[PDB]
């Protein structure tokens with residue numbers, strides 16, 4: 558008890574950042590996946606103190622942080638060193654964040670949990686599973702030779718706003734506020750391109766590509782609902798993969814949000830593996 562210490566902090570400094578990364582690595586290796594910590598958000602000063610660091614004789618063994626992204630909720634990331642689990646560390650860390658979230662007119666807190674780790678007991682105490690977030694990677698240097706579909710592909714320009722806004726409205730319905738200007742931001746940023754898939758003369762799908770020097774990231778893949786289930790999505794992803802490989806990139810990444818595990822088979826079939834996976838559970842503060 559003498560060496561147990563909790564510091565409430567508005568922003569982590571160099572020290573506190575490097576300790577958090579160490580704890581993250583130990584959790585990552587022990588559990589396979591880690592919650593989202595948003596390391597860029599932690600170097601940044603905020604109105605209330607936002608991170609709760611748990612030390613035992615100077616060593617960081619526990620961490621809780623709270624995040625304010627949208628109006629109705631607060632995202633909570635919690636990490637305890639595997640050595641020190643089930644000793645109350647996480648519970649104590651919650652009590653420190655509570656008075657602060659009541660200072661913000663928030664009563665709903667959402668936890669990011671490594672996939673498969675905590676399913677049985679988040680059920681028991683009333684947590685509501687919401688959705689899952691997967692970061693996937695394909696290290697295979699061999700291209701995808703297989704999906705011959707009646708599709709042609711072209712790169713999107715600023716004249717493709719209506720196509721891109723229409724595709725996003727029906728494939729990402731609870732998301733698209735001011736898509737016009739979001740796609741305008743994307744198409745004005747050199748690191749991004751958007752592939753449009755065409756079935757005859759109809760655009761039926763799109764995929765975003767964020768290029769880096771040695772990799773590229775696919776995101777916001779969409780196929781018109783009436784055209785799904787015909788292999789067009791797999792053909793579009795494979796086209797982006799072969800495009801990425803032909804530019805000498807050694808890796809394709811992919812961010813995807815799902816509500817069940819079955820939806821990932823699609824990406825497994827194309828050579829992706831899970832690098833990180835989190836399920837987002839919910840609860841109001843009333844249920845302690």
Ligand SMILES: CC(=O)SCCNC(=O)CCNC(=O)[C@H](O)C(C)(C)COP(=O)(O)OP(=O)(O)OC[C@H]1O[C@@H](n2cnc3c(N)ncnc32)[C@H](O)[C@@H]1OP(=O)(O)O
Nearest residue numbers: 588635636637642643644645646647648668669670671678
């Ligand atoms: C309540 C939360 O911890 S938030 C869930 C968010 N998920 C994550 O953070 C996953 C990250 N991966 C990890 O391994 C994490 O470090 C953790 C959550 C396992 C570490 O948490 P701990 O410090 O070991 O939990 P702690 O000892 O403080 O107990 C907290 C409560 O959750 C329960 N609990 C903790 N771990 C488990 C577990 N593996 N299985 C079942 N119940 C558990 C405890 O019984 C306790 O419940 P109670 O107060 O009603 O008796």
Ligand SMILES: CC(=O)SCCNC(=O)CCNC(=O)[C@H](O)C(C)(C)COP(=O)(O)OP(=O)(O)OC[C@H]1O[C@@H](n2cnc3c(N)ncnc32)[C@H](O)[C@@H]1OP(=O)(O)O
Nearest residue numbers: 777778779780785786787788789790791813814820822823
């Ligand atoms: C940031 C992000 O979230 S982007 C990732 C996309 N997430 C979304 O929410 C977008 C939803 N919008 C959509 O248009 C679609 O639902 C998409 C993009 C998910 C997939 O589009 P589709 O054209 O329906 O995919 P496709 O027809 O190629 O494959 C469907 C199924 O058949 C399988 N399949 C298709 N073709 C083959 C084939 N030749 N051989 C073997 N299996 C095949 C796939 O494995 C897949 O399996 P699953 O549904 O059980 O996971």
